[PDB]
């Protein structure tokens, strides 16, 4: 509590007696030392930005039963929790991927590149030629019309950026966010 609440609730006659005041102070000190912090922990869990670190660990452990997260990768833990809980609503779009890559890699900006395939299937089989979007306009392959396939390529500008570590971190952390019907086929760098 405060620095003299329990003492101040004695009658005016007993407050001037030494032993009663000392006993009240001792009891208040014991209660503050052993009881108060847990009550404060109970009352301070309303907002994610005011909780202690143990409660943050508890909430992150709750969140970790469905995703794979390491809290030391990002700059702050409350930001990690709030942002992941917010991007849950954007299931299936590019926003969660881009924002997670920016957040967990100290500020790397990326652009998702889909893959295109040719339509003439009897002359070119399905998986022999695959072109990203950036090289689609500037190419000479497949000698024909194109179509979109459910595959993707990540494009990283070397300025913000070593490839193996990025691939490892991506496969371990961000790939689970991809939909079940989308396939990831490595990195591209410019």
């Amino acid at each position: 509590m405060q620095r003299s609440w329990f003492n101040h609730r004695l009658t005016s006659a007993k407050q001037k007696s030494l032993l009663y005041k000392s006993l009240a102070d001792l009891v208040q000190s014991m209660m503050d030392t052993f009881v108060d912090p847990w009550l404060e922990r109970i009352t301070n869990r309303k907002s994610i930005f005011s909780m202690s670190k143990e409660d943050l660990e508890t909430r992150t452990n709750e969140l970790g039963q469905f995703f794979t997260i390491r809290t030391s990768n990002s700059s702050s833990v409350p930001m990690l929790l709030q942002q992941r809980l917010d991007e849950i609503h954007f299931k299936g779009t590019e926003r969660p991927i881009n924002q997670t890559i920016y957040r967990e890699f100290n500020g790397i900006s990326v652009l998702w590149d889909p893959i295109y395939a040719p339509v003439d299937l009897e002359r070119h089989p399905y998986g022999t030629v695959l072109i990203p979007e950036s090289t689609l306009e500037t190419t000479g392959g497949t000698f024909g019309e194109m179509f979109l396939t459910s595959r993707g390529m990540i494009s990283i500008p070397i300025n913000d950026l070593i490839t193996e570590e990025i691939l490892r971190k991506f496969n371990q952390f961000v790939k689970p966010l991809l939909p079940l019907h989308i396939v990831f086929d490595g990195l591209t760098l410019y």
Binding site: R9, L39, T43, S76, M79, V119, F147, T149
Partner: protein, 473 residues
């Protein structure tokens, strides 16, 4: 016992005390009772604090508005704020040396202690002018950045938060002062972007937080943060014409101009009740469009674009079934067709594409639009109408009713604005004509009838070209 009373604690003390030489004498006495009561007070406090905090923890079982506001992740609309009242006034001019142009935001004290900040600018053509007033006043608070840390917070006092209508944050470093925009939850935020997020304390105190270096810009070590608040009281009204408003804080004009209200100054609003706040706190994502929930494209298009008579959404398999060929390029494609009563097809394409573009798009899917094809049909009716009625009136009423029921601009295709395409069939015409009581007998015939797929074929009736043969009994 989980519920500790005074008697139980005194009994515990008496149970422990026995078999002691000094203490067993004073078992029944006033001193022990007073000591036990004074000790039990703390235990009561701790137990009740734990229970109350546990109860107030959840949004569902919270008993106060402040706790619900504090627990709410967003506040944009979770917690409403008072809105100012407005009215019209007239500014007479007395004597000479009165200003030619009345200044904007001129404070006017009312008959009571109500400030009135006139909006707009006023010109006295012959000593008479008319402007709008908005009941609110501008106060300011300042703060200095003594140390730079993550998640810096600046908190207002209770009285200012009780009457806060708007909040504007100005942070000045060196000789440059710049306003910082707010953000919902640091959405699309990063370094070099100046944003802040509001929050509500368990006590009635509003706040502003700038967070982290990566996702926000911490205010520099040597800057001063200033908040400006517009203060207002909602449900306060002034009658029209019976009130005089002297000028205050610019008292040089008090003698020069006389100001009197013309219309009642009312229509302010106040803060919401706790139950409404909690209900809006659970469902706020509802108010503002963010994403296409549940993959319902037609419903989204109906909501965003008002007036769409009908719209349909395709799939690759359905197009494959329609054209009967496995594939040309129909992979990861979404087709859409629709019709608006009073605008061209290309304009509809542009609106639909823009509306879909505003919301974030799905991964590896592109939209394509199919233009509608019109296939009108016509009918021929032969019947008798009895001698009581007139042939011309019957024909005119029949034409009007048929055009209203089945027509290009008719509502038959979605009687409710839930997005569904409903196709006209032959039984409907017979039934609708039968419900009208004109004809003793009729024999319908269909001309130019077509069988339409529900996807991109339009079938409707052309009343004018249709021929009606009506003869007296």
């Amino acid at each position: 016992k989980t519920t500790p009373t005074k008697d139980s604690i005194r009994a515990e003390f008496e149970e422990l005390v026995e078999k002691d030489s000094f203490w067993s004498k004073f078992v029944g006495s006033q001193f022990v009772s007073m000591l036990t009561l004074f000790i039990t007070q703390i235990v009561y406090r701790c137990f009740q604090y734990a229970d109350a905090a546990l109860a107030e923890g959840f949004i569902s079982t919270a008993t106060r508005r402040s706790s619900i506001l504090a627990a709410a992740e967003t506040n944009s609309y979770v917690g409403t704020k008072p809105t100012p009242s407005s009215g019209m006034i007239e500014i007479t001019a007395t004597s000479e040396d009165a200003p030619a142009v009345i200044p904007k935001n001129m404070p006017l004290i009312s008959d009571d202690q109500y400030p009135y900040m006139t909006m707009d600018v006023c010109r006295l053509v012959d000593g008479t002018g008319t402007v709008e007033v908005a009941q609110l006043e501008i106060q300011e608070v300042t703060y200095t950045v003594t140390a730079a840390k993550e998640f810096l917070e600046v908190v207002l006092s209770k009285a200012l938060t009780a009457v806060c209508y708007k909040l504007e944050v100005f942070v000045t470093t060196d000789g440059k002062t710049t306003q910082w925009s707010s953000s919902t939850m640091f959405r699309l935020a990063g370094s070099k972007s100046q944003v802040y997020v509001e929050f509500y304390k368990p006590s009635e105190q509003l706040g502003v937080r700038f967070g982290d270096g990566l996702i926000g810009q911490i205010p520099p070590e040597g800057s001063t943060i200033t908040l400006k608040v517009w203060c207002t009281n909602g449900d306060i009204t002034l009658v029209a014409g019976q009130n005089l408003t002297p000028v205050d804080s610019a008292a040089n004009l008090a003698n020069l101009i006389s100001v009197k209200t013309t219309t009642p100054i009312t229509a302010g609003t106040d803060a919401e009740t706790t139950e409404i706040t909690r209900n809006r706190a659970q469902y706020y994502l509802a108010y503002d469009d963010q994403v296409v929930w549940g993959g319902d494209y037609t419903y989204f298009l109906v909501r965003n674009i008002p007036g769409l008579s009908w719209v349909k959404a395709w799939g690759e398999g359905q197009q494959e079934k329609l054209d009967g060929a496995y594939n040309v390029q129909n992979i990861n494609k979404i087709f859409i067709s629709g019709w608006h009563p009073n605008k061209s097809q290309s304009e509809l394409e542009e609106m639909i594409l823009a509306a879909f573009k505003k919301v974030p798009n799905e991964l590896n899917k592109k939209f394509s639009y199919k233009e509608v094809r019109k296939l009108p049909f016509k009918i021929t009716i032969t019947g008798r109408i009895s001698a009581s009625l007139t042939i011309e009136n019957v024909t005119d009423e029949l034409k009007s009713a048929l055009e209203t029921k089945f027509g290009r601009d008719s509502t038959f295709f979605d009687p409710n604005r839930v997005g569904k395409y409903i196709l006209i069939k032959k039984k409907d015409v017979w039934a609708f004509i039968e419900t009208l009581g004109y004809f003793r007998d009729f024999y319908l015939e269909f001309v130019e009838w077509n069988e339409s797929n529900g996807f991109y074929d339009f079938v409707y009736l052309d009343t004018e070209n249709s021929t009606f043969n009506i003869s007296y009994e």
